[PDB]
């Protein structure tokens, strides 16, 4: 019941906040160390928010061979206790 319909990266707003609006309004360009906002859309209404939050993690990878030791891959949960 946690299917994903779409994810909006909000390229215009984030690029405005991250001083990359001159680059594009469609591609997400962000600068490290500063938060950016995305919107996750679900196919069905989410009944219980906390178990669903416990059920989801995010992974960011860069390069052809991403790994933790190279710091080219990070897996982090979606929670208010995350290291900002």
């Amino acid at each position: 019941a946690l299917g994903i319909k779409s994810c909006d990266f909000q390229a215009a707003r984030n690029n405005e906040e991250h001083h990359t609006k001159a680059l594009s309004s469609r591609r997400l360009f962000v600068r490290r160390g500063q938060p950016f906002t995305i919107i996750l859309y679900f196919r069905a209404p989410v009944r219980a928010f906390l178990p669903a939050l416990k059920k989801v993690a995010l992974t960011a990878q860069t390069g052809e061979q991403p790994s933790k030791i190279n710091r080219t891959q990070a897996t982090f949960p979606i929670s208010s206790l995350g290291d900002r």
Partner: protein, 451 residues
């Protein structure tokens, strides 16, 4: 059920569950049967993020338990260093007293929490506040045998608050959340440090636009002059903070305010070569001919710093090219004294007089020859500076150069046709000066010439 679950989440550090409960409508100021709210429980268990979030959601910071304990009391007794730092950063009263008279410093001292004791002492905790039994933090530390706490308490004594006020700290980090909480608690945005500076001064120093806007919107004085006379506009102009200068000018900062030494913001901008700031100040009516206590105009400051483009901009804005200080120093005199031949070129090309006299009759050529500034020398002699000008004492440039022993200056002066047989007020030739100062090479070149 909802409030009890919120308190359980606050105890366990389940920030997601507590935030969900707060979103549902749970009163954030709810407490258990012991009078411990969510902030108290989070401070007990050391949940820093939960403490910060609850402070951001407007929890009453000085709420006491049934024992009179604030959150800072509980964090100090529990020895939660990060929680103590965060609570103090958000404006916790370090000298709060429970019903039995205990202070946070007493609780940290009795529990042998050295780091908490030191942090509270640096934040102005009074170690002389006694309990209802008459015991001090030192007394309980002595009774419990906490030797390190006893030693630190004795060594600190009554030095007092050596940390900045919390609003100054927030302004330094451009932290709008902590500043908002602090100003919600204490409505005075002009809190003074021991040096006399407001948080607006710090925000202007670091160009922290967001916290500066917040402070100005909460009633901070844009024109707060301390005893030294350094307004936030002075600081922003000195630091080259263009956007801060524009913001402060828009909020009513005065353009003509003087420091203790009568420095205007234009003086600070020109001293550090901030061309855009100088143009902004001039367009707002800053007096280009304002003088300091020593009679220095901003063109003097720009020439002193080798700030070529600032000199150019000031000259374009009708600055007086031959303005004199109290020592009758022109900007050309300053450029010769500091060896800035580019500034001298700009000044001479714009019509500065090459033979201006200082108080002791020194020309820019005399000063350039004194300081071995050969490029300024060639530039002055190229633009009609007298090679035989004398001071009040009758010193020629060759006299000065021979006394200082600057061989290239002497060589160039004699090659351009300076007589080595000129005399001072006392009959003293350049060879006399070279002999007196023991410059064998200068004297040898003089004697090889017609001296």
């Amino acid at each position: 059920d909802a409030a009890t679950s919120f308190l359980r989440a606050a105890r366990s550090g389940n920030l997601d569950k507590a935030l969900d409960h707060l979103r549902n409508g749970v009163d954030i100021n709810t407490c258990n049967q012991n009078g411990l709210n969510g902030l108290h429980l989070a401070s007990k268990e050391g949940h820093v993020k939960m403490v910060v979030e609850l402070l951001h959601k407007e929890i009453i910071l000085e709420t006491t338990t049934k024992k009179g304990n604030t959150a800072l009391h509980i964090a100090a007794l529990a020895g939660q260093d990060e929680v103590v730092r965060e609570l103090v950063n958000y404006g916790a009263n370090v000298n709060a007293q429970s019903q039995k008279g205990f202070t946070p410093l007493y609780m940290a001292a009795q529990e042998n929490h050295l780091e908490v004791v030191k942090f509270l002492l640096e934040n102005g905790a009074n170690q002389n506040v006694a309990t209802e039994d008459g015991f001090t933090p030192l007394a309980v530390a002595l009774q419990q045998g906490h030797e390190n706490v006893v030693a630190h308490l004795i060594n600190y004594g009554t030095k007092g608050k050596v940390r900045l006020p919390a609003l100054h700290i927030a302004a330094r980090n451009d932290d709008t959340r902590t500043a908002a909480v602090l100003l919600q608690n204490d409505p005075n945005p002009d809190v003074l440090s021991k040096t006399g500076f407001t948080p607006l001064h710090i925000a202007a120093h670091y160009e922290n636009l967001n916290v500066a806007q917040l402070l100005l919107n909460r009633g901070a004085s844009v024109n707060f002059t301390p005893q030294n006379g350094i307004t936030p506009l002075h600081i922003a102009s000195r630091r080259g903070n263009v956007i801060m200068v524009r913001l402060l000018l828009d909020r009513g900062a005065q353009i003509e305010t003087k420091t203790k030494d009568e420095l205007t913001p234009l003086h600070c901008a020109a001293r550090n070569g901030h061309v855009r700031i100088s143009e902004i100040l001039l367009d707002h009516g800053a007096p280009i001919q304002a003088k300091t206590k020593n009679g220095l105009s901003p063109i003097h400051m720009a020439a002193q710093g080798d700030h070529l483009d600032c000199v150019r901009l000031l000259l374009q804005y009708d600055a007086e090219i031959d303005d004199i200080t109290l020592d009758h120093l022109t900007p050309l005199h300053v450029a010769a004294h500091c060896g800035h031949h580019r500034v001298a070129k700009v000044l001479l090309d714009k019509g500065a007089k090459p033979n201006s006299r200082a108080l002791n009759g020194f020309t820019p050529l005399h000063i350039a020859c004194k300081k071995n500034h050969v490029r300024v020398m060639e530039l002055l002699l190229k633009t009609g500076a007298s090679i035989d000008a004398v001071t009040e004492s009758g010193l020629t440039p060759l006299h000065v150069a021979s006394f200082m022993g600057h061989l290239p200056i002497v060589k160039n002066l004699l090659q351009r046709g300076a007589s080595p047989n000129v005399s001072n007020v006392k009959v003293e030739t350049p060879l006399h000066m070279a002999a007196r100062a023991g410059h064998t090479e200068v004297a040898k070149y003089l004697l090889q010439n017609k001296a």
